[PDB]
Amino acid sequence: GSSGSSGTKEHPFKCNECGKTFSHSAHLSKHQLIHAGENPSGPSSG
Ligand SMILES: [Zn+2]
């Protein structure tokens, strides 16, 4: 058949923390640092 029913979001890199997608890894890896607390909280509320 085919690997990827959906049309868009066909990037080889997909974040598992949120569910994002990046064409290149460098982008993902970098976008991952955001999940590892890399900014001062504020308006956040759990
Ligand atoms: Zn993410």
PDB file of all heavy atoms in Angstrom:
ATOM      1  N   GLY A   1       0.806  -1.206   0.000  1.00  0.00           N
ATOM      2  CA  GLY A   1       0.000   0.000   0.000  1.00  0.00           C
ATOM      3  C   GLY A   1       0.842   1.260   0.000  1.00  0.00           C
ATOM      4  O   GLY A   1       1.575   1.526  -0.952  1.00  0.00           O
ATOM      5  N   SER A   2       0.737   2.041   1.071  1.00  0.00           N
ATOM      6  CA  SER A   2       1.491   3.283   1.189  1.00  0.00           C
ATOM      7  C   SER A   2       1.742   3.630   2.654  1.00  0.00           C
ATOM      8  O   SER A   2       0.899   3.378   3.516  1.00  0.00           O
ATOM      9  CB  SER A   2       0.740   4.427   0.504  1.00  0.00           C
ATOM     10  OG  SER A   2      -0.331   4.888   1.309  1.00  0.00           O
ATOM     11  N   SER A   3       2.907   4.208   2.928  1.00  0.00           N
ATOM     12  CA  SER A   3       3.272   4.586   4.287  1.00  0.00           C
ATOM     13  C   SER A   3       2.996   6.067   4.533  1.00  0.00           C
ATOM     14  O   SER A   3       3.876   6.910   4.368  1.00  0.00           O
ATOM     15  CB  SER A   3       4.748   4.282   4.545  1.00  0.00           C
ATOM     16  OG  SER A   3       5.006   2.891   4.454  1.00  0.00           O
ATOM     17  N   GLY A   4       1.764   6.375   4.927  1.00  0.00           N
ATOM     18  CA  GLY A   4       1.392   7.754   5.188  1.00  0.00           C
ATOM     19  C   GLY A   4       0.088   8.139   4.518  1.00  0.00           C
ATOM     20  O   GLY A   4       0.084   8.887   3.540  1.00  0.00           O
ATOM     21  N   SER A   5      -1.020   7.627   5.042  1.00  0.00           N
ATOM     22  CA  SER A   5      -2.335   7.918   4.485  1.00  0.00           C
ATOM     23  C   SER A   5      -2.538   9.423   4.327  1.00  0.00           C
ATOM     24  O   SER A   5      -2.819   9.911   3.233  1.00  0.00           O
ATOM     25  CB  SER A   5      -3.432   7.335   5.377  1.00  0.00           C
ATOM     26  OG  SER A   5      -3.257   5.940   5.553  1.00  0.00           O
ATOM     27  N   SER A   6      -2.392  10.151   5.430  1.00  0.00           N
ATOM     28  CA  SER A   6      -2.562  11.599   5.417  1.00  0.00           C
ATOM     29  C   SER A   6      -1.704  12.237   4.329  1.00  0.00           C
ATOM     30  O   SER A   6      -0.672  11.694   3.939  1.00  0.00           O
ATOM     31  CB  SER A   6      -2.199  12.188   6.781  1.00  0.00           C
ATOM     32  OG  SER A   6      -0.841  11.939   7.100  1.00  0.00           O
ATOM     33  N   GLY A   7      -2.139  13.397   3.845  1.00  0.00           N
ATOM     34  CA  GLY A   7      -1.401  14.092   2.807  1.00  0.00           C
ATOM     35  C   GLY A   7      -0.250  14.907   3.361  1.00  0.00           C
ATOM     36  O   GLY A   7       0.903  14.711   2.976  1.00  0.00           O
ATOM     37  N   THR A   8      -0.562  15.827   4.269  1.00  0.00           N
ATOM     38  CA  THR A   8       0.454  16.678   4.875  1.00  0.00           C
ATOM     39  C   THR A   8       1.111  15.987   6.066  1.00  0.00           C
ATOM     40  O   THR A   8       0.821  14.827   6.360  1.00  0.00           O
ATOM     41  CB  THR A   8      -0.141  18.020   5.340  1.00  0.00           C
ATOM     42  OG1 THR A   8      -1.271  17.787   6.189  1.00  0.00           O
ATOM     43  CG2 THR A   8      -0.562  18.867   4.149  1.00  0.00           C
ATOM     44  N   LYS A   9       1.996  16.707   6.746  1.00  0.00           N
ATOM     45  CA  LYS A   9       2.694  16.164   7.906  1.00  0.00           C
ATOM     46  C   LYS A   9       3.407  14.863   7.553  1.00  0.00           C
ATOM     47  O   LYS A   9       3.282  13.865   8.260  1.00  0.00           O
ATOM     48  CB  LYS A   9       1.709  15.923   9.052  1.00  0.00           C
ATOM     49  CG  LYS A   9       1.407  17.168   9.867  1.00  0.00           C
ATOM     50  CD  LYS A   9       0.107  17.028  10.641  1.00  0.00           C
ATOM     51  CE  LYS A   9      -1.101  17.113   9.722  1.00  0.00           C
ATOM     52  NZ  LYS A   9      -2.319  17.572  10.447  1.00  0.00           N
ATOM     53  N   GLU A  10       4.157  14.883   6.454  1.00  0.00           N
ATOM     54  CA  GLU A  10       4.889  13.704   6.009  1.00  0.00           C
ATOM     55  C   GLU A  10       6.385  13.861   6.274  1.00  0.00           C
ATOM     56  O   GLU A  10       7.216  13.348   5.526  1.00  0.00           O
ATOM     57  CB  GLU A  10       4.648  13.459   4.518  1.00  0.00           C
ATOM     58  CG  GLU A  10       5.376  14.440   3.614  1.00  0.00           C
ATOM     59  CD  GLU A  10       4.548  15.672   3.304  1.00  0.00           C
ATOM     60  OE1 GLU A  10       3.512  15.532   2.622  1.00  0.00           O
ATOM     61  OE2 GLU A  10       4.937  16.774   3.743  1.00  0.00           O
ATOM     62  N   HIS A  11       6.717  14.576   7.345  1.00  0.00           N
ATOM     63  CA  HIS A  11       8.112  14.801   7.710  1.00  0.00           C
ATOM     64  C   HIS A  11       8.684  13.591   8.443  1.00  0.00           C
ATOM     65  O   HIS A  11       7.996  12.916   9.208  1.00  0.00           O
ATOM     66  CB  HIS A  11       8.237  16.047   8.585  1.00  0.00           C
ATOM     67  CG  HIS A  11       7.731  17.295   7.927  1.00  0.00           C
ATOM     68  ND1 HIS A  11       8.044  18.561   8.374  1.00  0.00           N
ATOM     69  CD2 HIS A  11       6.931  17.464   6.848  1.00  0.00           C
ATOM     70  CE1 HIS A  11       7.457  19.457   7.599  1.00  0.00           C
ATOM     71  NE2 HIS A  11       6.776  18.817   6.666  1.00  0.00           N
ATOM     72  N   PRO A  12       9.973  13.309   8.204  1.00  0.00           N
ATOM     73  CA  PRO A  12      10.666  12.180   8.831  1.00  0.00           C
ATOM     74  C   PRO A  12      10.888  12.393  10.324  1.00  0.00           C
ATOM     75  O   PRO A  12      11.293  11.476  11.039  1.00  0.00           O
ATOM     76  CB  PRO A  12      12.006  12.131   8.093  1.00  0.00           C
ATOM     77  CG  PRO A  12      12.222  13.522   7.606  1.00  0.00           C
ATOM     78  CD  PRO A  12      10.855  14.071   7.303  1.00  0.00           C
ATOM     79  N   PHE A  13      10.619  13.608  10.790  1.00  0.00           N
ATOM     80  CA  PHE A  13      10.790  13.941  12.200  1.00  0.00           C
ATOM     81  C   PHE A  13       9.480  14.440  12.803  1.00  0.00           C
ATOM     82  O   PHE A  13       8.882  15.398  12.312  1.00  0.00           O
ATOM     83  CB  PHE A  13      11.879  15.004  12.365  1.00  0.00           C
ATOM     84  CG  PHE A  13      13.169  14.651  11.683  1.00  0.00           C
ATOM     85  CD1 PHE A  13      13.529  15.261  10.492  1.00  0.00           C
ATOM     86  CD2 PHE A  13      14.024  13.709  12.233  1.00  0.00           C
ATOM     87  CE1 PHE A  13      14.715  14.940   9.861  1.00  0.00           C
ATOM     88  CE2 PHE A  13      15.213  13.383  11.607  1.00  0.00           C
ATOM     89  CZ  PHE A  13      15.558  13.998  10.420  1.00  0.00           C
ATOM     90  N   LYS A  14       9.040  13.784  13.871  1.00  0.00           N
ATOM     91  CA  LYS A  14       7.802  14.159  14.543  1.00  0.00           C
ATOM     92  C   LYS A  14       7.973  14.120  16.059  1.00  0.00           C
ATOM     93  O   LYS A  14       8.285  13.075  16.631  1.00  0.00           O
ATOM     94  CB  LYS A  14       6.665  13.225  14.123  1.00  0.00           C
ATOM     95  CG  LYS A  14       5.413  13.372  14.970  1.00  0.00           C
ATOM     96  CD  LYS A  14       5.438  12.438  16.168  1.00  0.00           C
ATOM     97  CE  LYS A  14       4.052  12.269  16.773  1.00  0.00           C
ATOM     98  NZ  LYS A  14       4.020  11.186  17.794  1.00  0.00           N
ATOM     99  N   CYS A  15       7.765  15.263  16.703  1.00  0.00           N
ATOM    100  CA  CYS A  15       7.895  15.359  18.152  1.00  0.00           C
ATOM    101  C   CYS A  15       6.875  14.464  18.850  1.00  0.00           C
ATOM    102  O   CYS A  15       5.708  14.417  18.464  1.00  0.00           O
ATOM    103  CB  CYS A  15       7.713  16.808  18.607  1.00  0.00           C
ATOM    104  SG  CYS A  15       7.917  17.057  20.400  1.00  0.00           S
ATOM    105  N   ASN A  16       7.325  13.756  19.881  1.00  0.00           N
ATOM    106  CA  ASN A  16       6.451  12.862  20.633  1.00  0.00           C
ATOM    107  C   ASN A  16       5.935  13.543  21.897  1.00  0.00           C
ATOM    108  O   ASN A  16       4.986  13.072  22.524  1.00  0.00           O
ATOM    109  CB  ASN A  16       7.197  11.577  21.001  1.00  0.00           C
ATOM    110  CG  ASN A  16       6.259  10.401  21.197  1.00  0.00           C
ATOM    111  OD1 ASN A  16       6.293   9.433  20.438  1.00  0.00           O
ATOM    112  ND2 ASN A  16       5.416  10.482  22.220  1.00  0.00           N
ATOM    113  N   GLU A  17       6.565  14.654  22.264  1.00  0.00           N
ATOM    114  CA  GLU A  17       6.168  15.399  23.453  1.00  0.00           C
ATOM    115  C   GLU A  17       4.871  16.163  23.210  1.00  0.00           C
ATOM    116  O   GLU A  17       3.999  16.221  24.077  1.00  0.00           O
ATOM    117  CB  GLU A  17       7.276  16.372  23.866  1.00  0.00           C
ATOM    118  CG  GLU A  17       8.647  15.725  23.968  1.00  0.00           C
ATOM    119  CD  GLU A  17       9.626  16.559  24.772  1.00  0.00           C
ATOM    120  OE1 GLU A  17       9.515  16.567  26.016  1.00  0.00           O
ATOM    121  OE2 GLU A  17      10.503  17.201  24.158  1.00  0.00           O
ATOM    122  N   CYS A  18       4.749  16.747  22.022  1.00  0.00           N
ATOM    123  CA  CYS A  18       3.559  17.508  21.662  1.00  0.00           C
ATOM    124  C   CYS A  18       2.868  16.896  20.447  1.00  0.00           C
ATOM    125  O   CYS A  18       1.652  16.711  20.438  1.00  0.00           O
ATOM    126  CB  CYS A  18       3.927  18.964  21.373  1.00  0.00           C
ATOM    127  SG  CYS A  18       5.086  19.176  19.983  1.00  0.00           S
ATOM    128  N   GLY A  19       3.655  16.584  19.420  1.00  0.00           N
ATOM    129  CA  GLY A  19       3.102  15.996  18.215  1.00  0.00           C
ATOM    130  C   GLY A  19       3.408  16.817  16.977  1.00  0.00           C
ATOM    131  O   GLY A  19       2.727  16.696  15.959  1.00  0.00           O
ATOM    132  N   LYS A  20       4.435  17.655  17.064  1.00  0.00           N
ATOM    133  CA  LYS A  20       4.830  18.500  15.944  1.00  0.00           C
ATOM    134  C   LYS A  20       5.621  17.701  14.913  1.00  0.00           C
ATOM    135  O   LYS A  20       5.894  16.515  15.105  1.00  0.00           O
ATOM    136  CB  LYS A  20       5.666  19.682  16.439  1.00  0.00           C
ATOM    137  CG  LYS A  20       4.839  20.904  16.798  1.00  0.00           C
ATOM    138  CD  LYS A  20       5.694  22.159  16.853  1.00  0.00           C
ATOM    139  CE  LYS A  20       4.841  23.417  16.805  1.00  0.00           C
ATOM    140  NZ  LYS A  20       5.671  24.652  16.823  1.00  0.00           N
ATOM    141  N   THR A  21       5.990  18.358  13.817  1.00  0.00           N
ATOM    142  CA  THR A  21       6.750  17.710  12.757  1.00  0.00           C
ATOM    143  C   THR A  21       7.700  18.692  12.080  1.00  0.00           C
ATOM    144  O   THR A  21       7.336  19.837  11.811  1.00  0.00           O
ATOM    145  CB  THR A  21       5.819  17.098  11.691  1.00  0.00           C
ATOM    146  OG1 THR A  21       4.977  18.114  11.135  1.00  0.00           O
ATOM    147  CG2 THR A  21       4.963  15.993  12.292  1.00  0.00           C
ATOM    148  N   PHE A  22       8.918  18.238  11.807  1.00  0.00           N
ATOM    149  CA  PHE A  22       9.920  19.078  11.162  1.00  0.00           C
ATOM    150  C   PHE A  22      10.627  18.320  10.042  1.00  0.00           C
ATOM    151  O   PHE A  22      10.965  17.145  10.191  1.00  0.00           O
ATOM    152  CB  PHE A  22      10.945  19.566  12.189  1.00  0.00           C
ATOM    153  CG  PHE A  22      10.325  20.085  13.455  1.00  0.00           C
ATOM    154  CD1 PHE A  22       9.737  19.216  14.360  1.00  0.00           C
ATOM    155  CD2 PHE A  22      10.331  21.441  13.738  1.00  0.00           C
ATOM    156  CE1 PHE A  22       9.165  19.692  15.526  1.00  0.00           C
ATOM    157  CE2 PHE A  22       9.761  21.922  14.902  1.00  0.00           C
ATOM    158  CZ  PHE A  22       9.179  21.047  15.797  1.00  0.00           C
ATOM    159  N   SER A  23      10.845  19.000   8.921  1.00  0.00           N
ATOM    160  CA  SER A  23      11.507  18.390   7.773  1.00  0.00           C
ATOM    161  C   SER A  23      12.887  17.866   8.158  1.00  0.00           C
ATOM    162  O   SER A  23      13.240  16.728   7.848  1.00  0.00           O
ATOM    163  CB  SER A  23      11.632  19.402   6.634  1.00  0.00           C
ATOM    164  OG  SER A  23      12.114  18.784   5.454  1.00  0.00           O
ATOM    165  N   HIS A  24      13.664  18.704   8.836  1.00  0.00           N
ATOM    166  CA  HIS A  24      15.006  18.327   9.265  1.00  0.00           C
ATOM    167  C   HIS A  24      15.045  18.071  10.768  1.00  0.00           C
ATOM    168  O   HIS A  24      14.247  18.627  11.522  1.00  0.00           O
ATOM    169  CB  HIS A  24      16.009  19.421   8.895  1.00  0.00           C
ATOM    170  CG  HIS A  24      16.553  19.290   7.505  1.00  0.00           C
ATOM    171  ND1 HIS A  24      16.642  20.352   6.630  1.00  0.00           N
ATOM    172  CD2 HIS A  24      17.038  18.215   6.842  1.00  0.00           C
ATOM    173  CE1 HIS A  24      17.158  19.935   5.487  1.00  0.00           C
ATOM    174  NE2 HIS A  24      17.408  18.642   5.591  1.00  0.00           N
ATOM    175  N   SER A  25      15.977  17.226  11.196  1.00  0.00           N
ATOM    176  CA  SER A  25      16.117  16.893  12.609  1.00  0.00           C
ATOM    177  C   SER A  25      16.517  18.122  13.419  1.00  0.00           C
ATOM    178  O   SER A  25      15.865  18.469  14.403  1.00  0.00           O
ATOM    179  CB  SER A  25      17.156  15.786  12.792  1.00  0.00           C
ATOM    180  OG  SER A  25      17.234  15.380  14.148  1.00  0.00           O
ATOM    181  N   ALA A  26      17.595  18.776  12.998  1.00  0.00           N
ATOM    182  CA  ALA A  26      18.082  19.966  13.683  1.00  0.00           C
ATOM    183  C   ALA A  26      16.926  20.788  14.245  1.00  0.00           C
ATOM    184  O   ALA A  26      17.013  21.327  15.348  1.00  0.00           O
ATOM    185  CB  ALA A  26      18.922  20.812  12.737  1.00  0.00           C
ATOM    186  N   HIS A  27      15.843  20.880  13.478  1.00  0.00           N
ATOM    187  CA  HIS A  27      14.671  21.637  13.900  1.00  0.00           C
ATOM    188  C   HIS A  27      13.993  20.968  15.092  1.00  0.00           C
ATOM    189  O   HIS A  27      13.711  21.615  16.102  1.00  0.00           O
ATOM    190  CB  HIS A  27      13.680  21.768  12.743  1.00  0.00           C
ATOM    191  CG  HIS A  27      14.239  22.487  11.554  1.00  0.00           C
ATOM    192  ND1 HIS A  27      14.165  21.989  10.270  1.00  0.00           N
ATOM    193  CD2 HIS A  27      14.881  23.674  11.459  1.00  0.00           C
ATOM    194  CE1 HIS A  27      14.740  22.838   9.437  1.00  0.00           C
ATOM    195  NE2 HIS A  27      15.183  23.869  10.134  1.00  0.00           N
ATOM    196  N   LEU A  28      13.733  19.671  14.969  1.00  0.00           N
ATOM    197  CA  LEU A  28      13.088  18.914  16.036  1.00  0.00           C
ATOM    198  C   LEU A  28      13.915  18.967  17.317  1.00  0.00           C
ATOM    199  O   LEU A  28      13.452  19.460  18.345  1.00  0.00           O
ATOM    200  CB  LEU A  28      12.884  17.461  15.605  1.00  0.00           C
ATOM    201  CG  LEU A  28      12.535  16.474  16.720  1.00  0.00           C
ATOM    202  CD1 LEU A  28      11.215  16.850  17.373  1.00  0.00           C
ATOM    203  CD2 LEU A  28      12.479  15.053  16.177  1.00  0.00           C
ATOM    204  N   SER A  29      15.140  18.457  17.246  1.00  0.00           N
ATOM    205  CA  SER A  29      16.031  18.443  18.400  1.00  0.00           C
ATOM    206  C   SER A  29      15.998  19.785  19.126  1.00  0.00           C
ATOM    207  O   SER A  29      15.931  19.839  20.355  1.00  0.00           O
ATOM    208  CB  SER A  29      17.461  18.122  17.963  1.00  0.00           C
ATOM    209  OG  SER A  29      18.014  19.184  17.205  1.00  0.00           O
ATOM    210  N   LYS A  30      16.046  20.868  18.358  1.00  0.00           N
ATOM    211  CA  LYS A  30      16.022  22.211  18.925  1.00  0.00           C
ATOM    212  C   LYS A  30      14.668  22.508  19.561  1.00  0.00           C
ATOM    213  O   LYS A  30      14.593  23.083  20.647  1.00  0.00           O
ATOM    214  CB  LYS A  30      16.329  23.250  17.844  1.00  0.00           C
ATOM    215  CG  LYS A  30      16.916  24.540  18.390  1.00  0.00           C
ATOM    216  CD  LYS A  30      17.772  25.245  17.351  1.00  0.00           C
ATOM    217  CE  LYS A  30      16.920  26.012  16.352  1.00  0.00           C
ATOM    218  NZ  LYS A  30      17.751  26.704  15.329  1.00  0.00           N
ATOM    219  N   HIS A  31      13.599  22.111  18.878  1.00  0.00           N
ATOM    220  CA  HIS A  31      12.246  22.333  19.377  1.00  0.00           C
ATOM    221  C   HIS A  31      11.978  21.484  20.616  1.00  0.00           C
ATOM    222  O   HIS A  31      11.008  21.712  21.337  1.00  0.00           O
ATOM    223  CB  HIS A  31      11.219  22.011  18.291  1.00  0.00           C
ATOM    224  CG  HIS A  31       9.876  21.629  18.831  1.00  0.00           C
ATOM    225  ND1 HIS A  31       8.882  22.547  19.098  1.00  0.00           N
ATOM    226  CD2 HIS A  31       9.363  20.418  19.154  1.00  0.00           C
ATOM    227  CE1 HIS A  31       7.818  21.918  19.562  1.00  0.00           C
ATOM    228  NE2 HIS A  31       8.083  20.625  19.606  1.00  0.00           N
ATOM    229  N   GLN A  32      12.844  20.503  20.854  1.00  0.00           N
ATOM    230  CA  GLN A  32      12.698  19.619  22.004  1.00  0.00           C
ATOM    231  C   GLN A  32      13.166  20.308  23.283  1.00  0.00           C
ATOM    232  O   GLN A  32      12.597  20.102  24.355  1.00  0.00           O
ATOM    233  CB  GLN A  32      13.491  18.329  21.787  1.00  0.00           C
ATOM    234  CG  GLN A  32      12.861  17.393  20.769  1.00  0.00           C
ATOM    235  CD  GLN A  32      13.294  15.952  20.955  1.00  0.00           C
ATOM    236  OE1 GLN A  32      14.486  15.650  20.997  1.00  0.00           O
ATOM    237  NE2 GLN A  32      12.323  15.052  21.069  1.00  0.00           N
ATOM    238  N   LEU A  33      14.206  21.126  23.161  1.00  0.00           N
ATOM    239  CA  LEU A  33      14.751  21.844  24.307  1.00  0.00           C
ATOM    240  C   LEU A  33      13.673  22.680  24.989  1.00  0.00           C
ATOM    241  O   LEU A  33      13.796  23.034  26.162  1.00  0.00           O
ATOM    242  CB  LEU A  33      15.907  22.745  23.866  1.00  0.00           C
ATOM    243  CG  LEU A  33      17.103  22.037  23.228  1.00  0.00           C
ATOM    244  CD1 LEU A  33      17.943  23.022  22.431  1.00  0.00           C
ATOM    245  CD2 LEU A  33      17.948  21.352  24.293  1.00  0.00           C
ATOM    246  N   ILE A  34      12.615  22.991  24.247  1.00  0.00           N
ATOM    247  CA  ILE A  34      11.514  23.782  24.781  1.00  0.00           C
ATOM    248  C   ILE A  34      10.688  22.974  25.777  1.00  0.00           C
ATOM    249  O   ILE A  34      10.114  23.525  26.716  1.00  0.00           O
ATOM    250  CB  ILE A  34      10.589  24.290  23.659  1.00  0.00           C
ATOM    251  CG1 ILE A  34       9.553  23.224  23.300  1.00  0.00           C
ATOM    252  CG2 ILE A  34      11.406  24.678  22.435  1.00  0.00           C
ATOM    253  CD1 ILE A  34       8.853  23.481  21.984  1.00  0.00           C
ATOM    254  N   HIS A  35      10.635  21.662  25.566  1.00  0.00           N
ATOM    255  CA  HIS A  35       9.882  20.776  26.446  1.00  0.00           C
ATOM    256  C   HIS A  35      10.637  20.536  27.750  1.00  0.00           C
ATOM    257  O   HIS A  35      10.034  20.243  28.783  1.00  0.00           O
ATOM    258  CB  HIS A  35       9.606  19.444  25.749  1.00  0.00           C
ATOM    259  CG  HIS A  35       8.512  19.517  24.728  1.00  0.00           C
ATOM    260  ND1 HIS A  35       7.197  19.776  25.053  1.00  0.00           N
ATOM    261  CD2 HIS A  35       8.543  19.364  23.384  1.00  0.00           C
ATOM    262  CE1 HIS A  35       6.467  19.777  23.951  1.00  0.00           C
ATOM    263  NE2 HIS A  35       7.260  19.531  22.925  1.00  0.00           N
ATOM    264  N   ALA A  36      11.958  20.659  27.693  1.00  0.00           N
ATOM    265  CA  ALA A  36      12.795  20.455  28.869  1.00  0.00           C
ATOM    266  C   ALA A  36      12.963  21.752  29.655  1.00  0.00           C
ATOM    267  O   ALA A  36      14.080  22.154  29.978  1.00  0.00           O
ATOM    268  CB  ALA A  36      14.154  19.905  28.462  1.00  0.00           C
ATOM    269  N   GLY A  37      11.844  22.404  29.958  1.00  0.00           N
ATOM    270  CA  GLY A  37      11.890  23.649  30.702  1.00  0.00           C
ATOM    271  C   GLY A  37      13.049  24.532  30.286  1.00  0.00           C
ATOM    272  O   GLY A  37      14.132  24.458  30.865  1.00  0.00           O
ATOM    273  N   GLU A  38      12.823  25.367  29.276  1.00  0.00           N
ATOM    274  CA  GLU A  38      13.860  26.265  28.783  1.00  0.00           C
ATOM    275  C   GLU A  38      13.347  27.700  28.709  1.00  0.00           C
ATOM    276  O   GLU A  38      13.677  28.442  27.785  1.00  0.00           O
ATOM    277  CB  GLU A  38      14.341  25.813  27.401  1.00  0.00           C
ATOM    278  CG  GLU A  38      15.497  24.829  27.453  1.00  0.00           C
ATOM    279  CD  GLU A  38      16.791  25.472  27.913  1.00  0.00           C
ATOM    280  OE1 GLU A  38      17.309  26.348  27.190  1.00  0.00           O
ATOM    281  OE2 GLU A  38      17.285  25.100  28.998  1.00  0.00           O
ATOM    282  N   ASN A  39      12.536  28.084  29.691  1.00  0.00           N
ATOM    283  CA  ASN A  39      11.975  29.429  29.738  1.00  0.00           C
ATOM    284  C   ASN A  39      11.230  29.662  31.049  1.00  0.00           C
ATOM    285  O   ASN A  39      10.637  28.749  31.626  1.00  0.00           O
ATOM    286  CB  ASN A  39      11.031  29.653  28.555  1.00  0.00           C
ATOM    287  CG  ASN A  39      10.089  28.485  28.338  1.00  0.00           C
ATOM    288  OD1 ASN A  39       9.769  27.749  29.272  1.00  0.00           O
ATOM    289  ND2 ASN A  39       9.639  28.309  27.101  1.00  0.00           N
ATOM    290  N   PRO A  40      11.258  30.913  31.531  1.00  0.00           N
ATOM    291  CA  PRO A  40      10.589  31.296  32.778  1.00  0.00           C
ATOM    292  C   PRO A  40       9.069  31.274  32.651  1.00  0.00           C
ATOM    293  O   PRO A  40       8.499  31.960  31.802  1.00  0.00           O
ATOM    294  CB  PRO A  40      11.085  32.723  33.023  1.00  0.00           C
ATOM    295  CG  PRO A  40      11.443  33.237  31.671  1.00  0.00           C
ATOM    296  CD  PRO A  40      11.945  32.050  30.897  1.00  0.00           C
ATOM    297  N   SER A  41       8.420  30.485  33.500  1.00  0.00           N
ATOM    298  CA  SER A  41       6.966  30.372  33.480  1.00  0.00           C
ATOM    299  C   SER A  41       6.313  31.702  33.842  1.00  0.00           C
ATOM    300  O   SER A  41       6.996  32.701  34.065  1.00  0.00           O
ATOM    301  CB  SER A  41       6.505  29.283  34.451  1.00  0.00           C
ATOM    302  OG  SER A  41       6.816  29.628  35.789  1.00  0.00           O
ATOM    303  N   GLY A  42       4.985  31.707  33.900  1.00  0.00           N
ATOM    304  CA  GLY A  42       4.261  32.918  34.236  1.00  0.00           C
ATOM    305  C   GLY A  42       2.759  32.714  34.239  1.00  0.00           C
ATOM    306  O   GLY A  42       2.159  32.375  35.260  1.00  0.00           O
ATOM    307  N   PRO A  43       2.126  32.924  33.075  1.00  0.00           N
ATOM    308  CA  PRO A  43       0.677  32.767  32.922  1.00  0.00           C
ATOM    309  C   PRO A  43       0.239  31.310  33.010  1.00  0.00           C
ATOM    310  O   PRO A  43      -0.952  31.014  33.106  1.00  0.00           O
ATOM    311  CB  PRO A  43       0.406  33.324  31.522  1.00  0.00           C
ATOM    312  CG  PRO A  43       1.693  33.155  30.791  1.00  0.00           C
ATOM    313  CD  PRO A  43       2.778  33.329  31.818  1.00  0.00           C
ATOM    314  N   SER A  44       1.209  30.402  32.976  1.00  0.00           N
ATOM    315  CA  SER A  44       0.923  28.974  33.048  1.00  0.00           C
ATOM    316  C   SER A  44       0.113  28.645  34.298  1.00  0.00           C
ATOM    317  O   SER A  44       0.217  29.328  35.317  1.00  0.00           O
ATOM    318  CB  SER A  44       2.225  28.170  33.045  1.00  0.00           C
ATOM    319  OG  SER A  44       1.966  26.781  33.156  1.00  0.00           O
ATOM    320  N   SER A  45      -0.696  27.593  34.213  1.00  0.00           N
ATOM    321  CA  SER A  45      -1.528  27.174  35.335  1.00  0.00           C
ATOM    322  C   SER A  45      -1.984  25.728  35.164  1.00  0.00           C
ATOM    323  O   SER A  45      -2.798  25.422  34.294  1.00  0.00           O
ATOM    324  CB  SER A  45      -2.745  28.093  35.466  1.00  0.00           C
ATOM    325  OG  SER A  45      -2.384  29.339  36.036  1.00  0.00           O
ATOM    326  N   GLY A  46      -1.451  24.843  36.001  1.00  0.00           N
ATOM    327  CA  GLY A  46      -1.814  23.441  35.927  1.00  0.00           C
ATOM    328  C   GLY A  46      -3.039  23.114  36.760  1.00  0.00           C
ATOM    329  O   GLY A  46      -3.562  24.002  37.430  1.00  0.00           O
TER     330      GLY A  46
HETATM  331 ZN    ZN B   1       7.247  19.221  20.859  1.00  0.00          ZN
END
